[PDB]
């Protein structure tokens, strides 16, 4: 679920913020 875009500064689940 969470913990993937922390590595991009995007945090979590969105279809591109
Ligand atoms: N929590 C969370 C979470 C969970 C899934 C996510 C998925 C789909 N999953 C499907 C399963 O395999 C890994 C991808 C895509 C994206 C995502 C895709 C592209 C970008 C664009 C714009 C920003 C950038 O650098 N790229 C930003 C965010 N963010 C997600 C965030």
UniProtKB/Swiss-Prot annotation:
Cell surface pattern recognition receptor that senses endogenous stress signals with a broad ligand repertoire including advanced glycation end products, S100 proteins, high-mobility group box 1 protein/HMGB1, amyloid beta/APP oligomers, nucleic acids, histones, phospholipids and glycosaminoglycans. Advanced glycosylation end products are nonenzymatically glycosylated proteins which accumulate in vascular tissue in aging and at an accelerated rate in diabetes. It comes from Homo sapiens. Induction: Induced in T cells by antigen stimulation and by the S100B ligand. Induced in trophoblasts by DNA damage. This is Advanced glycosylation end product-specific receptor. Constitutive homodimer; disulfide-linked. Forms homooligomers. Interacts with S100A1 and APP. Interacts with S100B, S100A12 and S100A14. Interacts with TIRAP. Interacts with HMGB1. Interacts with LGP2; this interaction plays an important role in AGER-mediated pro-inflammatory responses and cytokine release. Interacts with double-strand break repair protein MRE11 which is a core component of the MRN complex. The interaction enhances MRE11 endonuclease activity and promotes DNA repair. It comes from the Eukaryota. It is found in: Cell membrane; Cell projection, Phagocytic cup; Early endosome; Nucleus. The chain holds residues 362 to 378 of 404 of the full protein. Phosphorylated on its cytoplasmic domain by PKCzeta/PRKCZ upon ligand binding. Phosphorylated by ATM following DNA damage. Targeted by the ubiquitin E3 ligase subunit FBXO10 to mediate its ubiquitination and degradation. Endothelial cells. Increased expression in pre-term labor and preeclampsia placentas compared to controls.
